[PDB]
Amino acid sequence: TNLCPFGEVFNATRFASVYAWNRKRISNCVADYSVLYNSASFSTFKCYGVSPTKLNDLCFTNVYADSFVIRGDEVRQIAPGQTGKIADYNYKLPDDFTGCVIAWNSNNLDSKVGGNYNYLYRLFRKSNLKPFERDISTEIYQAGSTPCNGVEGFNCYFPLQSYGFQPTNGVGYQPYRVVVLSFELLHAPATVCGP
Amino acid sequence: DIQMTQSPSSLSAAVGDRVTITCRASQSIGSYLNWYQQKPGKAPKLLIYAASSLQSGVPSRFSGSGSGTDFTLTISSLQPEDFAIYYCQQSYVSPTYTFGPGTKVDIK
Amino acid sequence: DIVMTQSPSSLSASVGDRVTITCRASQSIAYYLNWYQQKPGKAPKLLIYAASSLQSGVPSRFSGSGSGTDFTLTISSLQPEDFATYYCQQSSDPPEYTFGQGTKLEIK
Amino acid sequence: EIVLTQSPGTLSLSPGERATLSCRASQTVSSTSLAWYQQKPGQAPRLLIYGASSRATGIPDRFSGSGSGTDFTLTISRLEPEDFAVYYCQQHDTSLTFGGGTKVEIKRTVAAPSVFIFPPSDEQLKSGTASVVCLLNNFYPREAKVQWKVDNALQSGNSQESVTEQDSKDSTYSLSSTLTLSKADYEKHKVYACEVTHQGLSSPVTKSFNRG
Amino acid sequence: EVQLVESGGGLVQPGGSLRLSCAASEFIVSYNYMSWVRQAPGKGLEWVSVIYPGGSTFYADSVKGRFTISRDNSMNTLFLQMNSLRAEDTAVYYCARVLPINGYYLDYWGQGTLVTVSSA
Amino acid sequence: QVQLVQSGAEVKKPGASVKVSCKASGYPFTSYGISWVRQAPGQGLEWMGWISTYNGNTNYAQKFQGRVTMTTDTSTTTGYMELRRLRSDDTAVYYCARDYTRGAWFGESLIGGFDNWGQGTLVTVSSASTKGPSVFPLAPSSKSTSGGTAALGCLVKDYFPEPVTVSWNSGALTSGVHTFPAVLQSSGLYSLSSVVTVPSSSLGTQTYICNVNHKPSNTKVDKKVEPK
């Protein structure tokens, strides 16, 4: 039968920004994790609520693939029960999370001489993000009593900022492509088993 | 990594008494916990998994309860062969499993 | 984790001269460094952010440049009002940002 | 769209040396969307490098690739006898396009072609079509020029030539030519000559044969 | 007008508890990053705590587990709660606004309040 | 063990259409698309399009945007390309390749290329009819130069299908024999020549005859070569 398209998620040319993170719905396929078992290029491989083993003998209903690019120091924030800019304003995971987090260094693909300014993240927000919530609005953030009315100035800021990737930075500041897989099991019959 | 802490460091109880061992997690881990007993100069043994389930062969005197960041192991009556160091382990984050520090039960 | 060190602990200049204050780091912090002017008895004032920018209202005689583990601050002309204490802050880490030991300045 | 130009068109080298090729793009192309292909004569092309830096399955360690921005380079450490073929580069950043192609050939010392000539056969006179062939023997440099001389007047636009492949036995080429004429014009002509100009020949060797 | 007025200093015994307040004008303490910095007499500045617009809180190791930073939207005031004060906590505390635009920098400051912990 | 096999060569008259086939085996068919690239005789590679074997999306080139259609049969794991309104300049070799440049399920770009190829199909679109080859011998000159070195050959002319086979002395001779590639004439037929160099010392004693094999016309004409 059909095999799940993990290669398209992992081996894609373009990755979305963290604030406008991408999500893909994988269903009606057999999932083969032998592609992930031995790769020698992954810097992070942590699975929450299920062992890395036993994945080929487990059946699930839906599998979601979330992909974005962040810096190395912010990879630790992609985990249940974490706080920070990325966790509170860009991407949130539930406390009771069943899934895996995979990250690898993409310094040779997403960094160019002079600075790559195509990846953005949100600085200001009124309230913390709920789990699996996506925000893409670009309205001017107001930090004072005076209304902004679209005239940027003091106490009226644009809520997005650029990463500015350079090839000479440290591994903490180098870009990392992060793929987050979320497995949900419901009363519906299993569709992704992968024996 | 998720850090597990136990209290008290040392416990002293007599035969037929009641004891209570508490295991606390630095993060909510739900019902992912295991308990191990290690007699001196021997290998650790498995007692409780999923924080409330009894492994086959373990005496019925043991029970477990709790969820989130608070867990408890209770021995109804302390038999003469139940003096050992007890460890709690979290099984929520993989594959980097972490163990507890250890609690010692002696005879007074 | 990161430890920052300024140099020197003191400095002097008469009038209409150039100065140089350096603030290293134990690890590379890219271009995330700030400069402050703390006159005695009151709160400090921001001079330079991101090691190269200038805060609105700051006199143009102040300038700074640098990257990685070495940074510097230069004053083109030493007006009478420029005598204070200056500090460097590490803005690289979002939650934890530390200061240096400071660098005073005085007449000779 | 992005246009890929490969230079140089031809590259003659001796086995055991190293080879450097260039694939230039008009715009900025991401490293994730470049690939190299190798096509031996009479066979389908095979993939060598994908992603501009990654070797394919079964590809020996000789082939290596590097580059970013608008210029890319393929590097071959040693030239084995089976590594002489045409190479192409492709991109899929904006649509899909291929390059012109670079050919790698075996290098050899200059040789001299032995020029021959053959008069038309008898049956062609019956068929009313005249064909004369100026055969050439082995010679290394591909660049060669021929020209049919009729009496005192040259000819143009009534001939075509074919060249064989580089034979592995001696690394030499062969050339053929044919002048197209009819019986109504073959008898009118008096002197038929074939003009040959080459580096291997110090002076043009224009063999000829009389009418009939 | 933009201002930050601080009040709450005093003299307390070791092991005591004190609460510091820092109002605002033209600001909204629940919309801006806010931080506390203390400066001991004859020493350099030291960061204490920071609160995010969403509500997250971060503390230094030397003061972790003893201090707490909070805010009131109705009164537009930023609070610092200090517990289990030692002899090493004697300093002048400042409340400042932090802009994460290009790194974290402290543009506006206050005037500071003195907190002294002594056995007398 | 990943193998793709295409159909044989075809000849079509202008204004018709030709559909090529490409059978695939040895890999999950639905996880990879199929790309088609054609190569004119003596020219470079030119892209045609890409097809997906999961949903059926197609991404054709702008040049062939109007007159190409691609279909995949999941049951037989075979892909097809149909080109309509055949033209004179459409004679080329068509290739079938497994695709790793665009994903099948989602349709985004990928890091890779065309990993596997096929043998190729030769398509000829010429306004001409089948004609049998005619052989004219090319006897050596009366004189001998640089003995012993002499060359002889036979000229083949006016044959429509490209592939022909020429052998000397019933294949007994395999040294110093050169066969020239065919060249297209203005009339619409082809002409081919094969020459062999032999020692002039034994020219009279050794007699050779060139043989021509033309499968489409089933014509075999053998003519010996002798001086005059």
Place this chain on the structure above:
Amino acid sequence: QVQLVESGGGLVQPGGSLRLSCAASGFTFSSYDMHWVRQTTGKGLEWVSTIGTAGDTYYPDSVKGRFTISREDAKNSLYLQMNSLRAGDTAVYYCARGDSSGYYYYFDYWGQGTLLTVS
């Protein structure tokens, strides 16, 4: 019954190499995961290696790049190759068998252990 016997430990100089083994009995060695756990009196129990049924190997950040775990189902022997040993690797090593009841994981059976000293 189920038993696991370790062997191949002793004294070794810093920076050297050593290879342990752990024979098994009473169960299908190819149908279960295998782990190595150390115990130091100053740090307690700690996980150092894990091998799966499908050839997957997992390592902590402490010993990654230095330890290699191998499995040979035919000989029923599980091995652990150690390289670039330091003074911090002196502990009693156990071989454990990993089993799961649902989504929950645990270590069921352990071996006697093998002392390794770095001097």
